[PDB]
Amino acid sequence: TTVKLTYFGHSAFHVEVDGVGIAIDPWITNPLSKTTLEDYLKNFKTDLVVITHAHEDHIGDALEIMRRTGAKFFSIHEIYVDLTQKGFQGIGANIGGPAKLDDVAPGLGIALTPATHSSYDKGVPTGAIIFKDGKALVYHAGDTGLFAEMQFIGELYAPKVALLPIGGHYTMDIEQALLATKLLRPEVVVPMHYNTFPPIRADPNEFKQKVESAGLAKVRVMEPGETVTFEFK
Ligand SMILES: [K+]
Ligand SMILES: [Zn+2]
Ligand SMILES: [Zn+2]
């Protein structure tokens, strides 16, 4: 199985997993992006939009993306209610076992995870694990501090690639993201949610050298607009 992973700055990603395009917290137009919304829409196919929580830095350009592409959303129940009432089409879920998304693509599932953070009045914040044929490929942590159930995610699923926030202040710092990496058992970690604004300034290369000197995993510091392909067998 093949995962083509594009980073757009902040916590915005496009995950292509065997010819289905899944966007997560798609603030394409964040301050560090090198991609306009026009560029994104020409260059990526969007089949699903994952929203981890309701902060605007994460919802981002979701609504316009969904209007222009026809893509459905995937999100926690409260956000599903708010967006369904606003006229959008999507799948709602909650924290637990994966949702079966066969209609989107055969064998695809996504589970919502805990996250120690906030989400205005729109339910609770989440992370998201993308499965194919029962295997956890990508865990996008949303915004979060440490959460003890990260250990269960490691043990039960060991998602291959972990997208983890490292900027501090509003989320785990580097130090906490290190412990998280240990708990979650990724093969590779892409750091996110850093440098966009002063309170979240952190050095992703500092993160890298500590995770790797600990032999905890490989860290792929991505650049806004960069794509990287991963195979796991
Ligand atoms: K915004
Ligand atoms: Zn947030
Ligand atoms: Zn955020």
Author numbering: 2 to 234
Task: Copy out sentences from the published article reporting this entry, exactly as the authors wrote them.
While these enzymes apparently exert a rather specific function, Igni18, a promiscuous and primordial representative of the MβL family, could represent an example of a typical ancestral enzyme, because its structure and active site resemble the core of many modern specialized enzymes. The characterization of Igni18 conducted in this study unveiled high promiscuity and multi-functionality depending on the availability of different metal ions. Igni18 is highly promiscuous and thermostable and serves as a prototype to study the evolution of the remarkably diverse MβL superfamily.
The overall fold of each monomer is composed of two mixed β-sheets (β14, β1, β2, β3, β4, β5, β6, and β7, β8, β9, β10, β11, β12, β13), slightly twisted and arranged in a parallel fashion in the center of the protein. Those are flanked by four helices on each side of the sheets (α1, α2, α3, α4 and α5, α6, α7, α8), thereby building the four-layered αββα core typical of the MβL superfamily. The structure of Igni18 revealed two Zn2+ ions bound per monomeric unit. The inductively coupled plasma-mass spectrometry (ICP-MS) analysis conducted to verify the incorporated ion revealed that Zn is preferably bound to the recombinantly produced and purified, non-stripped protein Igni18 with 87.5% mass fraction (data available upon request). However, both methods did not result in binding poses in which cleavable bonds of the ligands approached the zinc ions closer than 7 Å. These results, alongside the fact that soaking the crystals with ligands remained unsuccessful, suggest that the loops surrounding the active center were not crystallized in a conformation receptive for ligand binding.
